[PDB]
């Protein structure tokens, strides 16, 4: 068997509106001895405010085990680790996986609202570009809203490493040219750590 | 024992200068029985001399072997299937994995160049962007060039799926401000199968 | 009988998607001897399958027989030699005919896009010109496009030798004056061996 | 034996200082019986102004015999029909071949002088351009000249048929930078039958 530790979503670790959780999925567990045992060493503390073993739903008849641990918004922000010790009889050795926030000095994302191209102006759909560059923790979230209500038809690229060791990404919004030309306002919503109150909003129109 | 088949590089399939290769990577293998055997089948017929064997090792204790098959540009860009038959002792049955081009409508790439943002002015280095959307087959190559010779400070995004069933990506060239202001012209060179001539270029200046 | 060896077309050698083929035309054969054997030698090695030989007749009361040998992109660009051997009536000695890519240090073409004249302003149509000069391999493919779509009424002069041992050609695009005066952007797509990525382009507007 | 009739050269059809000439080349005359009887007739009237040159031996043990007929500048350009009746002892009945001037409504060239392009200013040597378009008879003659005296280093493209069924060609003069920036006059001298006085001149300066 093998184990993979997955981190929490980047939005819930900046927002007190939701719960941040780290999930430890054990896979290729034969039915021989399920005996899945999760010993969560937060920092150096072995006791676990652990959560259910749901086992989710069957793909090749499940055999897949998950435990989730509610983490603290502050603990992940303060760069401390979370182990996951999977002990099984079919394992000669236990599998210990450690996850921690990107251990560097956080940098602020520089948001830039790039407007449509001259080439695109003669089209029924025009594409609005937000560029988010310069953030060291690749843990970010980009959303698009206009006049205060959310929008759809947008797609954000994964963060990509740059030359300075930082990260950047582009978020593109597809709107009809009816709204852009009539002068509606569109807003790029970026949520990172280094931003003041984990939120910045740059607005775009013409 | 687990195997992986990788298509040729996009530039290599769209360019007369290079030799495109499908790559069959068997990972983990064993330490006890490192001998692998590669059998390459194109469209049902076995290709022998067409493949070479890179001899390799690794640092997860276990080794990594890899075999590469030179295809003809026109065979890959047609509906041809390439099968890899990996036999090792550690496997009961040979593992056969087949790969071929993305069957479907070739859809033409639209190259949009967006100029530097107002905020990046009065800064040391500026960033120039290249939005490429609408291409389907997802095997695309994009580089930058100014005054004939190429440029190095570019990173292009992983092709991200759109609602249309299309694809898009972005490209970021970071140039010294003074070269941008001195009027030098930068160009975005994209290669794809759906393009007439398999090549297009958009320009960025002022 | 007479024999003639014809080389690949220039666009076919610089674009993968096309089959470049050398053509061996024997004209003025006789009714007494209507069966002509063509034996193709490439770099000495005889290739028989790569032949395809149809048949037909001309108004001369003579016959014309043709044999095509599909060449590889990599060979012609790397100066390999192609031979076709034509033995019909008498003449045991079939051919002296052998073709190759010209031998010379390749030279990069120089594209200059020159705008319509002052006199052409005041006319229903305008003519846009593309000076391509300085190339030593002579094999070049030049076309006009706009809006990423190929154009139609353009005509290009054959390559003509310049004083420098280089070649130069000119390409005229004929487009409606409404189109030029409304601000479209027209471009010159030139493919040649010496160019970086075998493709360059310059554009014109206003 | 095979008969060929070659028309007069374009420059001397327009200029009175030269003598235009129709030439009648008979080839594949054999050693056995040379003795070729050239009998010319213009329109319908046989003329005895023709001069049969001596017989000339080739490497193929064939004789080539030629006769030249001096024509009238008007009569050629008036579309008159010139026939050559060659009679040998070998052939059964004499061979005849006819040439006339290109029979279509003559069309006047339109000459535009195009200056050099922006990219070309930085170069030690700069190229001036002459576009001659819209002319029907493919027989034209182009020259370059600055400050009266004729000029060197000018190369003309072959005539090129266009879509409208007329012809066009380019002429490039290569001059050093100093000549162009100093404001010197440059002139493109174009001689075509539809031009009044068969000569025009267009000019190009800074
Ligand atoms: O050199 C032979 C010449 O004869 C005369 C005529 O104008 C041309 O055919 C020219 O070529």
JSON list of C-alpha atoms in Angstrom, two decimals, chain D residues 47-157:
[
{"chain": "D", "resi": 47, "resn": "UNK", "atom": "CA", "xyz": [10.67, 39.48, -99.00]},
{"chain": "D", "resi": 48, "resn": "UNK", "atom": "CA", "xyz": [14.27, 38.98, -100.05]},
{"chain": "D", "resi": 49, "resn": "UNK", "atom": "CA", "xyz": [15.87, 41.10, -97.29]},
{"chain": "D", "resi": 50, "resn": "UNK", "atom": "CA", "xyz": [16.67, 37.96, -95.30]},
{"chain": "D", "resi": 51, "resn": "UNK", "atom": "CA", "xyz": [20.24, 36.87, -94.60]},
{"chain": "D", "resi": 52, "resn": "UNK", "atom": "CA", "xyz": [20.95, 33.14, -94.12]},
{"chain": "D", "resi": 53, "resn": "UNK", "atom": "CA", "xyz": [23.94, 32.68, -91.82]},
{"chain": "D", "resi": 54, "resn": "UNK", "atom": "CA", "xyz": [26.51, 29.90, -92.40]},
{"chain": "D", "resi": 55, "resn": "UNK", "atom": "CA", "xyz": [25.84, 26.37, -91.24]},
{"chain": "D", "resi": 56, "resn": "UNK", "atom": "CA", "xyz": [27.12, 25.61, -87.73]},
{"chain": "D", "resi": 57, "resn": "UNK", "atom": "CA", "xyz": [28.10, 22.19, -86.38]},
{"chain": "D", "resi": 58, "resn": "UNK", "atom": "CA", "xyz": [27.06, 20.94, -82.96]},
{"chain": "D", "resi": 59, "resn": "UNK", "atom": "CA", "xyz": [28.36, 18.10, -80.79]},
{"chain": "D", "resi": 60, "resn": "UNK", "atom": "CA", "xyz": [25.42, 15.89, -81.88]},
{"chain": "D", "resi": 61, "resn": "UNK", "atom": "CA", "xyz": [26.65, 15.67, -85.52]},
{"chain": "D", "resi": 62, "resn": "UNK", "atom": "CA", "xyz": [23.68, 17.88, -86.46]},
{"chain": "D", "resi": 63, "resn": "UNK", "atom": "CA", "xyz": [23.80, 21.15, -88.32]},
{"chain": "D", "resi": 64, "resn": "UNK", "atom": "CA", "xyz": [21.96, 24.27, -87.16]},
{"chain": "D", "resi": 65, "resn": "UNK", "atom": "CA", "xyz": [21.15, 26.86, -89.83]},
{"chain": "D", "resi": 66, "resn": "UNK", "atom": "CA", "xyz": [19.74, 30.33, -89.14]},
{"chain": "D", "resi": 67, "resn": "UNK", "atom": "CA", "xyz": [18.31, 33.25, -91.14]},
{"chain": "D", "resi": 68, "resn": "UNK", "atom": "CA", "xyz": [17.51, 36.75, -89.90]},
{"chain": "D", "resi": 69, "resn": "UNK", "atom": "CA", "xyz": [14.97, 39.13, -91.38]},
{"chain": "D", "resi": 70, "resn": "UNK", "atom": "CA", "xyz": [15.15, 42.82, -90.55]},
{"chain": "D", "resi": 71, "resn": "UNK", "atom": "CA", "xyz": [11.64, 44.02, -89.74]},
{"chain": "D", "resi": 72, "resn": "UNK", "atom": "CA", "xyz": [9.89, 47.40, -89.45]},
{"chain": "D", "resi": 73, "resn": "UNK", "atom": "CA", "xyz": [9.34, 48.74, -85.91]},
{"chain": "D", "resi": 74, "resn": "UNK", "atom": "CA", "xyz": [5.79, 49.70, -86.86]},
{"chain": "D", "resi": 75, "resn": "UNK", "atom": "CA", "xyz": [5.05, 46.45, -88.72]},
{"chain": "D", "resi": 76, "resn": "UNK", "atom": "CA", "xyz": [6.03, 44.19, -85.82]},
{"chain": "D", "resi": 77, "resn": "UNK", "atom": "CA", "xyz": [4.16, 46.37, -83.32]},
{"chain": "D", "resi": 78, "resn": "UNK", "atom": "CA", "xyz": [1.32, 46.54, -85.89]},
{"chain": "D", "resi": 79, "resn": "UNK", "atom": "CA", "xyz": [0.80, 42.79, -85.24]},
{"chain": "D", "resi": 80, "resn": "UNK", "atom": "CA", "xyz": [2.02, 41.64, -88.65]},
{"chain": "D", "resi": 81, "resn": "UNK", "atom": "CA", "xyz": [2.50, 37.93, -89.29]},
{"chain": "D", "resi": 82, "resn": "UNK", "atom": "CA", "xyz": [5.97, 36.69, -90.24]},
{"chain": "D", "resi": 83, "resn": "UNK", "atom": "CA", "xyz": [6.41, 33.23, -91.73]},
{"chain": "D", "resi": 84, "resn": "UNK", "atom": "CA", "xyz": [9.47, 31.13, -92.49]},
{"chain": "D", "resi": 85, "resn": "UNK", "atom": "CA", "xyz": [9.34, 28.52, -95.27]},
{"chain": "D", "resi": 86, "resn": "UNK", "atom": "CA", "xyz": [12.30, 26.18, -94.79]},
{"chain": "D", "resi": 87, "resn": "UNK", "atom": "CA", "xyz": [12.72, 23.57, -97.52]},
{"chain": "D", "resi": 88, "resn": "UNK", "atom": "CA", "xyz": [15.31, 20.80, -97.27]},
{"chain": "D", "resi": 89, "resn": "UNK", "atom": "CA", "xyz": [16.07, 17.92, -99.65]},
{"chain": "D", "resi": 90, "resn": "UNK", "atom": "CA", "xyz": [15.50, 15.44, -96.75]},
{"chain": "D", "resi": 91, "resn": "UNK", "atom": "CA", "xyz": [11.98, 16.41, -95.62]},
{"chain": "D", "resi": 92, "resn": "UNK", "atom": "CA", "xyz": [8.99, 15.53, -97.90]},
{"chain": "D", "resi": 93, "resn": "UNK", "atom": "CA", "xyz": [7.11, 18.86, -97.88]},
{"chain": "D", "resi": 94, "resn": "UNK", "atom": "CA", "xyz": [8.47, 22.19, -96.58]},
{"chain": "D", "resi": 95, "resn": "UNK", "atom": "CA", "xyz": [8.01, 23.23, -92.92]},
{"chain": "D", "resi": 96, "resn": "UNK", "atom": "CA", "xyz": [6.43, 26.58, -92.04]},
{"chain": "D", "resi": 97, "resn": "UNK", "atom": "CA", "xyz": [6.26, 28.49, -88.77]},
{"chain": "D", "resi": 98, "resn": "UNK", "atom": "CA", "xyz": [4.63, 31.84, -88.04]},
{"chain": "D", "resi": 99, "resn": "UNK", "atom": "CA", "xyz": [5.03, 34.50, -85.34]},
{"chain": "D", "resi": 100, "resn": "UNK", "atom": "CA", "xyz": [3.14, 37.73, -84.71]},
{"chain": "D", "resi": 101, "resn": "UNK", "atom": "CA", "xyz": [3.20, 40.33, -82.00]},
{"chain": "D", "resi": 102, "resn": "UNK", "atom": "CA", "xyz": [1.16, 39.38, -78.92]},
{"chain": "D", "resi": 103, "resn": "UNK", "atom": "CA", "xyz": [-2.44, 39.90, -80.09]},
{"chain": "D", "resi": 104, "resn": "UNK", "atom": "CA", "xyz": [-4.39, 41.53, -77.29]},
{"chain": "D", "resi": 105, "resn": "UNK", "atom": "CA", "xyz": [-5.50, 45.08, -76.67]},
{"chain": "D", "resi": 106, "resn": "UNK", "atom": "CA", "xyz": [-2.29, 46.86, -75.55]},
{"chain": "D", "resi": 107, "resn": "UNK", "atom": "CA", "xyz": [-2.33, 48.16, -71.99]},
{"chain": "D", "resi": 108, "resn": "UNK", "atom": "CA", "xyz": [-0.16, 50.96, -70.58]},
{"chain": "D", "resi": 109, "resn": "UNK", "atom": "CA", "xyz": [2.17, 50.16, -67.66]},
{"chain": "D", "resi": 110, "resn": "UNK", "atom": "CA", "xyz": [1.48, 51.94, -64.37]},
{"chain": "D", "resi": 111, "resn": "UNK", "atom": "CA", "xyz": [4.79, 52.86, -62.73]},
{"chain": "D", "resi": 112, "resn": "UNK", "atom": "CA", "xyz": [5.10, 53.58, -59.01]},
{"chain": "D", "resi": 113, "resn": "UNK", "atom": "CA", "xyz": [8.45, 54.33, -57.38]},
{"chain": "D", "resi": 114, "resn": "UNK", "atom": "CA", "xyz": [8.58, 52.87, -53.95]},
{"chain": "D", "resi": 115, "resn": "UNK", "atom": "CA", "xyz": [11.15, 54.26, -51.52]},
{"chain": "D", "resi": 116, "resn": "UNK", "atom": "CA", "xyz": [13.15, 52.02, -49.16]},
{"chain": "D", "resi": 117, "resn": "UNK", "atom": "CA", "xyz": [11.57, 50.61, -46.02]},
{"chain": "D", "resi": 118, "resn": "UNK", "atom": "CA", "xyz": [12.03, 51.65, -42.39]},
{"chain": "D", "resi": 119, "resn": "UNK", "atom": "CA", "xyz": [13.98, 48.49, -41.51]},
{"chain": "D", "resi": 120, "resn": "UNK", "atom": "CA", "xyz": [16.46, 49.28, -44.28]},
{"chain": "D", "resi": 121, "resn": "UNK", "atom": "CA", "xyz": [17.50, 52.78, -43.11]},
{"chain": "D", "resi": 122, "resn": "UNK", "atom": "CA", "xyz": [20.14, 51.49, -40.70]},
{"chain": "D", "resi": 123, "resn": "UNK", "atom": "CA", "xyz": [22.01, 49.59, -43.48]},
{"chain": "D", "resi": 124, "resn": "UNK", "atom": "CA", "xyz": [25.13, 50.77, -45.32]},
{"chain": "D", "resi": 125, "resn": "UNK", "atom": "CA", "xyz": [23.42, 50.07, -48.64]},
{"chain": "D", "resi": 126, "resn": "UNK", "atom": "CA", "xyz": [19.74, 50.70, -49.36]},
{"chain": "D", "resi": 127, "resn": "UNK", "atom": "CA", "xyz": [17.42, 49.44, -52.11]},
{"chain": "D", "resi": 128, "resn": "UNK", "atom": "CA", "xyz": [15.11, 51.52, -54.32]},
{"chain": "D", "resi": 129, "resn": "UNK", "atom": "CA", "xyz": [12.14, 49.85, -55.94]},
{"chain": "D", "resi": 130, "resn": "UNK", "atom": "CA", "xyz": [10.24, 50.25, -59.22]},
{"chain": "D", "resi": 131, "resn": "UNK", "atom": "CA", "xyz": [6.87, 48.52, -59.68]},
{"chain": "D", "resi": 132, "resn": "UNK", "atom": "CA", "xyz": [5.63, 48.34, -63.29]},
{"chain": "D", "resi": 133, "resn": "UNK", "atom": "CA", "xyz": [2.11, 46.93, -63.43]},
{"chain": "D", "resi": 134, "resn": "UNK", "atom": "CA", "xyz": [-0.92, 46.67, -65.67]},
{"chain": "D", "resi": 135, "resn": "UNK", "atom": "CA", "xyz": [0.71, 46.19, -69.07]},
{"chain": "D", "resi": 136, "resn": "UNK", "atom": "CA", "xyz": [-0.43, 43.67, -71.69]},
{"chain": "D", "resi": 137, "resn": "UNK", "atom": "CA", "xyz": [2.39, 42.98, -74.20]},
{"chain": "D", "resi": 138, "resn": "UNK", "atom": "CA", "xyz": [4.99, 41.13, -72.17]},
{"chain": "D", "resi": 139, "resn": "UNK", "atom": "CA", "xyz": [7.68, 43.03, -74.09]},
{"chain": "D", "resi": 140, "resn": "UNK", "atom": "CA", "xyz": [8.91, 45.88, -71.88]},
{"chain": "D", "resi": 141, "resn": "UNK", "atom": "CA", "xyz": [12.34, 47.32, -71.04]},
{"chain": "D", "resi": 142, "resn": "UNK", "atom": "CA", "xyz": [13.36, 48.94, -67.72]},
{"chain": "D", "resi": 143, "resn": "UNK", "atom": "CA", "xyz": [16.42, 51.06, -66.83]},
{"chain": "D", "resi": 144, "resn": "UNK", "atom": "CA", "xyz": [17.71, 53.15, -63.94]},
{"chain": "D", "resi": 145, "resn": "UNK", "atom": "CA", "xyz": [19.60, 56.44, -64.02]},
{"chain": "D", "resi": 146, "resn": "UNK", "atom": "CA", "xyz": [20.53, 59.16, -61.51]},
{"chain": "D", "resi": 147, "resn": "UNK", "atom": "CA", "xyz": [21.55, 62.75, -62.36]},
{"chain": "D", "resi": 148, "resn": "UNK", "atom": "CA", "xyz": [21.45, 61.99, -66.08]},
{"chain": "D", "resi": 149, "resn": "UNK", "atom": "CA", "xyz": [24.17, 59.33, -66.34]},
{"chain": "D", "resi": 150, "resn": "UNK", "atom": "CA", "xyz": [23.02, 55.69, -66.53]},
{"chain": "D", "resi": 151, "resn": "UNK", "atom": "CA", "xyz": [23.39, 53.43, -63.53]},
{"chain": "D", "resi": 152, "resn": "UNK", "atom": "CA", "xyz": [24.75, 50.03, -62.52]},
{"chain": "D", "resi": 153, "resn": "UNK", "atom": "CA", "xyz": [23.62, 47.49, -59.91]},
{"chain": "D", "resi": 154, "resn": "UNK", "atom": "CA", "xyz": [19.98, 47.28, -60.87]},
{"chain": "D", "resi": 155, "resn": "UNK", "atom": "CA", "xyz": [18.21, 43.98, -61.40]},
{"chain": "D", "resi": 156, "resn": "UNK", "atom": "CA", "xyz": [14.77, 43.53, -62.95]},
{"chain": "D", "resi": 157, "resn": "UNK", "atom": "CA", "xyz": [12.33, 40.70, -62.27]}
]
